[PDB]
Symmetry: D2
Subunit: 440 residues, 4 copies
């Protein structure tokens, strides 16, 4: 791999620097206080494994803007395709005047998603819009209303995706009333419930059948790895068992692969590790090299249930974002990012080999470049305090680490798949020393 | 020459051509059937007043991708900003890692929107997300639940924005159950109701007070000109009276300026035309020269009600889109597109001089580059059939014009503000001869 | 007719009397403050046309406990049935252990309700429970979700019946969120809209088709005379046209006859006056001579759509209340209360011959023993102050008169059908003298 | 005690007898299919522990009309009170014309319910109406929206109370969409979860804090013993801890004592067995000796939050039902039915000595005259088939047994507290012989 900016960490004695401090004051004056960014620097370049700020700091990027910049934040093929497309046209609204890159991205998605059955796609802008439209096609197809979601789920910040999201603070509180006919089932969380995949599936199926009923249920929606919920990997056989139940009970099984999709996990989709074939898949984030695109891909007969003009949105499938995605997907093949994702896991597990020694480390989990540590206290309760402290410390040392978890006690690793081995190991070494410092 | 592509209409004997025909069969196999595009040609350039298709046809663009490409479909300042931003970084997620263009776009919105009170902004991707977030800050600020919307309203295709949208077909049907605590009031539709502004407002307030109650009501949401509902302009005084009632009753007044904003009506915001000062204003479409961007701008105290992390979305305020928006807004100022919008209204009214001679034309309405004609039968009832036939005849002659209206009987005009006078006149002459041909 | 207590009005200069004042002190200590009884006397007897209080006052009853004690408040046949049933059994729960009086009352309702098609009934306690169960059998039967109700409607105080009710204060305010998928259509209110029945029906059907869609709609629910809304009588042909549209569009037409049913209007059901044949009819109030009973009666195939145990309620079709209802219906037949209700309408219109002295009287409307006066001010606006003054003056003079109306400007007349002519004329002469005095 | 009808079991070889068969044919013609009664006889008398049918059969009553006829089916003091009251007046509507027996029942409830704090009451007809009004006062008082309920909960058959009810079949299926802002927490079901009281409460509270948030929550509603769900008695300490959490979090703790109240469990309120003092308590069933009455009793400040007219219902607090209830409550005191309940428990545990052995019997549980057996197969899975067969076998031998359970595998015992000991022992011996016969 060749890089445009230096791939080495460096932070000044005073962070933020003066230009970033100035931009932070403008942000306080102009921007809703809810938008409280974590990085103590204003980005001017994102390339390989580095975020470069307005003051010359270079932060190691283990965030990829939350699993979005899988191909890098400024991949040359993506930037070239974006520039070229904008010079031809930025927008026509596909429903009004169509264009080839929309159709080409639908074909790409139909080809890359699990299963050999006939599939169709529809393109939107945000992950929340993709989840909303996945619910729309399932309701239109089944003629049934209810939506089943899981403990620890996250599906977005719209009224319905807030209902589907498990965590009240800060995603839901004060924004209700929320969309009705949404029902929640227990998740396979093996660290906490010690259940096998099939046992966890029996428990979930028992709730859904007792409390909801197949005859009322359009869809069951699950993240094959739960993201904001804490990189929760279900026990083997769990997802398969839920998919089988949905097929037997004429319920649409929807995999939300917005975070887990496009090689993040070392497979094209996380569904592939257990060879689960979802009826419908939502994608976003890594799809378009950072440009705003999302998609719903599914069985042709499900995707065709809505009538003419029944799905839409002005910007959906923006031609510049579609050109970006076509360029990014080809990069993923050409640069063998699937093998890089697999190598990223090996390196993380290697650098975390000493973490067993720490009574605060409950579990190391995930797949490919979607890995996490869960942190606990002396009595085994979630350790959100320590999680926050370790992330703030890493940050002061020039490493951007994200937290998540139902209980706020999970450090996640989301490096871009183009990060240099040298840069990744430096990043993971800073994390382990910050964990040493905060527990010692 | 002022334009990249020729600014003259040309359609072949057979449209679609074989390239567009081959693309339509690819669309049929790969894309959900709900997305049935209107233009019989696949777009390769959008520049000035023209859409060029893959077969060499040139259509006059009186759509601007539904009031999005105000500054033209491939504006050179927009294309430059987009290419340059993508080469530095496509995305960081503002909530994680901040950047200047997000802050500058909030500053620009705060400055350009009505009122000299303290304002803050939050950026998202689609118009529906912007409306969803306007409701969220109104609910967070008031501690009240209910939402009031109007007859003929359109607000988007999410679960809450469908509830907020008036027309069932095709936007809402089969997608329920929809978010509750949404109440609908009668609209000032002077052609149909014959009411003064103050009278229509008294009627709307009487329904709100009787059925909803201020003590239950977070917000009143209205388009200052109703777009999809038929370019409905409320009677003079209506918006002020509703604005006054909200202030007197602790209810947030929200102007949906997604279609009517950014000089579309010959003012910066349609609200300006009666110096109404909304508490909160939603923007999208024309804001970013075709890139996916939307915004909520309001009174600082309303925008800051949500807590840290309580508003968000991965892509919102994309740096490539914010770069495009800063460029488009500079073009609006520097090319004085405000005057171009006023001249466009003059030209539209001038070419429609002889529409007096048509009993089928009920009304010519709107302002600037947001103009419409409502078509009726011999009884004075809506004539959707004539509306569709005129649109299809115009398309066959190489002019793209859109239709809308609760009853499907409104031809709307949404030229880009950079359209050449000769191109606009040719487009309008084709529309007038299509109406002549189709009414005999 | 034979009476148990004296049938002449006699009310003290000072009311409440001492025994009623002491009871009111106990009420204030023990009963939720929302229950604020109007009559300045504690009832010890209700017989014929009279409410006798603890202090010996005899008030003329033009309320019949809100259209409930149609056969009188202590009919000797009803009283004897109630005594006799309770000494056999008070209760078994019909769906556990059945009993003949439940079945006999289902047969009575099947027979007395409009239409010659096969009908079945289910019995509950309150009118709200009967409206809830009418919606349940329509949803079960159609497999569709939405519910259509009208301006000025009143259907009860449960979560769903509050949503169905139009007026926020005091019935709905503060008790949300309320059941979703409830849509409101405009009412035929001839005094205000000037529309023919067919014109009002076209207007309502336009809203329902535009905003709801038959494909989403289980049922249309309307009171054939709107009770709490102000004894609104739709223009001739309105109910027929709505019933026709429901038949043509596979939507269940539900008549709410809770107030209007059981000879209140001089027909068995107010639907009879225009030969309308509802799919489903809700009854309560006058059905059981004051005992708590309600009923859903409908097409056998609609009533049978719910499966075994899918409808219920512990008390529903209480054997004591059914014994009361069979006795009350036998009185209605034996005492020819149908003719009495027509004579009561004639006596009311006779005693109101001079309301032409009053520009405050906008309309006299209703049928049988369901008659009303709407009051306006000198500018033609609703006159709730005069309405409340007249009712307060009447009570003080010893006449119980209820008020109602969306705008609180309607005096209603709901005398029991067993009222003596001399008692009714005294009552009406008091009302007319109260109107002369409050306007004079 | 003194019985009006012979207290010995007698059934013919063939049931139903012929009068009951003629009545069942009339029911099938006239009554909605959902209301398929279980007893193979039409009831003519209910007295002591006997249901006498139209054909001379005498069934032992282990049902009491689902926990309603606590004082017997035709108690002489209740029957006399009902006859005397009906002969004076059946109904006035308390909120129109008040009467002493409504006030006297509010005083009785204020005095009998847990705690010494100031209380007020409101009277309705059904248990579901009481739960609906408990939610209404909790929302009015808190100004918060959400309702927490538990797994296995049963609260009624209205839109909101169905939402609050856990089990889909047959109570909820096909009747949505249901009222929103209802959240479910896991229940203390020690047999199934092997959890302690304290653990179970922490588990429930973790869900409520994480998914709902106190700042959004009006009320927590729980049955102190879960009736339809399977007579689930929570582990000791569970209810206390939920009550403690609600007081610390400004959330209203509503105890649903509709089935468990008025001495059924051998305390006045099942809450008493743990010194829990509910903020609000809902009662019905046993309150009025089989007459239709329900009540909401709570803290005066909570009960007074709704404004004048904001709670209501035509029939609520019917004077005949209040007379019945005042007579029933005097019988409970004067005949020491509290001791009769404690004695019935001893008799049930005695006759069950040669049961709890049977491997198919998982648990005997409950208190007083609220006792149940849960049945399993060889695997330990729920045994609904055996449950149905035992109950069918018992009925044919002249004993009325109800079943219940989330999984349909619970035989419940609800004798009237006036049953003779020899009648109860005969009934329980039939149950054991039926279980012996049906376990092949
Ligand atoms: C699985 C899964 N589904 C859906 C979504 C929603 O995608 P949008 O593009 O953020 O709307 C996400 C977005 N996750 C990032 C959350 C960050 C924040 O906003 O707090 C996801 O992870
Ligand atoms: C006023 C107003 N508010 C909100 C929206 C929603 O904007 P999104 O960007 O399409 O979500 C719009 C979108 N305009 C109609 C789009 C046409 C279609 O999709 O069928 C609007 O006009
Ligand atoms: C048409 C119609 N449908 C339904 C209902 C509901 O009947 P319930 O028996 O009061 O529940 C009514 C009750 N009308 C009197 C309510 C008075 C009050 O409570 O303030 C009605 O009139
Ligand atoms: C705890 C609890 N709360 C509330 C209720 C509801 O009381 P209503 O009087 O039946 O409405 C009940 C009614 N229980 C019997 C239901 C039988 C059936 O109808 O299937 C209860 O047990």
């Amino acid at each position: 791999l060749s890089y445009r900016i230096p791939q080495s960490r460096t932070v000044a004695e005073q962070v933020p620097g003066p230009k970033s401090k100035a931009l932070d004051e403008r942000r306080q004056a102009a921007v809703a206080r809810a938008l409280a960014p974590g990085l103590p620097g204003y980005v001017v370049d994102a390339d390989g494994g580095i975020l470069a700020d307005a003051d010359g700091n270079r932060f190691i990027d283990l965030a990829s803007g939350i699993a979005v910049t899988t191909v890098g934040g400024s991949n040359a093929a993506v930037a070239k395709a974006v520039g070229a497309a904008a010079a031809r046209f930025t927008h026509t609204c596909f429903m009004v005047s169509p264009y080839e890159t929309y159709v080409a991205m639908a074909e790409r998605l139909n080809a890359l998603t699990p299963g050999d059955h006939d599939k169709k796609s529809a393109l939107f802008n945000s992950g929340a819009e993709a989840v909303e439209n996945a619910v729309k096609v399932a309701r239109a197809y089944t003629g049934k209303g209810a939506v089943v979601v899981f403990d620890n789920a996250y599906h977005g910040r719209t009224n319905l995706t807030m209902a589907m999201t498990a965590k009240n603070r800060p995603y839901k509180s004060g924004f209700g009333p929320l969309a009705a006919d949404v029902y929640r089932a227990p998740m396979s969380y093996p660290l906490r419930d010690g259940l096998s995949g099939p046992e966890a599936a029996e428990r979930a199926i028992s709730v859904i059948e007792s409390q909801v009923g197949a005859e009322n249920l359009a869809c069951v929606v699950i993240e094959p790895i739960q993201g904001e919920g804490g990189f929760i990997v279900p026990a083997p056989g769990f997802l398969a068992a839920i998919s089988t139940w949905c097929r037997e009970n004429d319920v649409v099984f929807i995999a939300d692969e917005i975070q887990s999709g496009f090689l993040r996990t070392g497979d094209w989709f996380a569904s592939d590790a257990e060879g689960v074939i979802p009826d419908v898949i939502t994608t976003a984030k890594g799809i378009a090299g950072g440009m705003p695109l999302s998609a719903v891909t599914g069985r042709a007969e499900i995707m065709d249930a809505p009538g003419p003009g029944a799905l839409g949105g002005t910007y959906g499938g923006n031609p510049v974002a579609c050109a970006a995605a076509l360029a990014a997907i080809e990069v993923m093949e050409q640069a063998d990012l699937k093998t890089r994702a697999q190598e990223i896991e090996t390196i993380i597990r290697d650098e975390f080999a000493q973490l067993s020694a720490f009574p605060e480390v409950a579990e190391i989990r995930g797949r490919g470049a979607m890995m996490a540590i869960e942190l606990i206290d002396a009595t085994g309760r979630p350790n959100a305090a320590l999680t926050a402290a370790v992330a703030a410390r890493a940050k002061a040392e020039g490493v951007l680490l994200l937290t998540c978890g139902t209980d706020g006690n999970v450090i996640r690793l989301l490096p871009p798949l183009v990060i240099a081995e040298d840069t990744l190991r430096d990043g993971l070494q800073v994390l382990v020393a910050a964990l040493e410092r905060e527990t010692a």
